[PDB]
């Protein structure tokens, strides 16, 4: 079926999430290890990851601007959105509505998660959160 | 400074959240043990908890309606909103937007939190997600 891909671009990791068949929940697929310094954006693995699915849209975590101004991570993300769009010929949506990193931290502390596990999980789950927030917005 | 109260009415608990001094983020205060079968909605305890603050709006969790129809919980909250509003002379918002319940569940499952603890934490945070839902709407 058609699925929406969710992505989180980092310096060292590309987070990958996929919508379920009903477009209700976001599933984690993988955290692609990548790196800008060599120009590694994780494109080859992404392509393999999605050849079995049919993706009609890509949602990409996009850092908030500083009141109209784009920062360097946002600049790399916008360039990556162009890359994505022109590589897969699907609409690419910049998105930031999700359970926030600070809400996650608070609730993780409330669950008694140790400081190092909190960091790992918050880093691991950014693409799932971005995609779930998008899907939750769409389902409204 | 004026604050916005967030509420989660249950059958035996009343979840209480309070906005920051700044109007941007919701904070958890307590989960009031009440007893709706006895007409104990925790009004007293509530009032005591908010006598130092000056509230100008209350955000109360409301169940979405199924094609304009709501269950026993919705009847209880809809009514509860009228009581709060006329009791405190502050506008009461009925919030029926979905919360980040499933996102929280997923993040807690990734952190290896057990089923019993996830349930407790998510129940604990209802008031805060409701209030947060609203603050972000403004």
From Swiss-Prot, chain A:
As for subcellular location, the record says: Cytoplasm
EC numbers listed for it are 3.1.-.-
Superkingdom of source: Bacteria
TM stretches of this protein: none
Any one GO molecular function term: nuclease activity
CDD domains in alphabetical order: YqgF
Q: What class of enzyme is it?
A: hydrolase
- Swiss-Prot/TrEMBL GO biological process terms: rRNA 5'-end processing
Gene Ontology CC = cytoplasm
What effect does gene inactivation have here? Not essential, it can be disrupted.
Q: What is its main location?
A: cytoplasm
Q: Which UniProt keywords apply?
A: Cytoplasm, Hydrolase, Nuclease, Ribosome biogenesis
Keyword Thylakoid present in the record's keywords: the answer is no
What this chain does, per the record?
Could be a nuclease involved in processing of the 5'-end of pre-16S rRNA.
Q: Which family does it belong to?
A: Belongs to the YqgF nuclease family.
The protein's name is: Putative pre-16S rRNA nuclease
Its source organism is: Bacillus subtilis (strain 168)
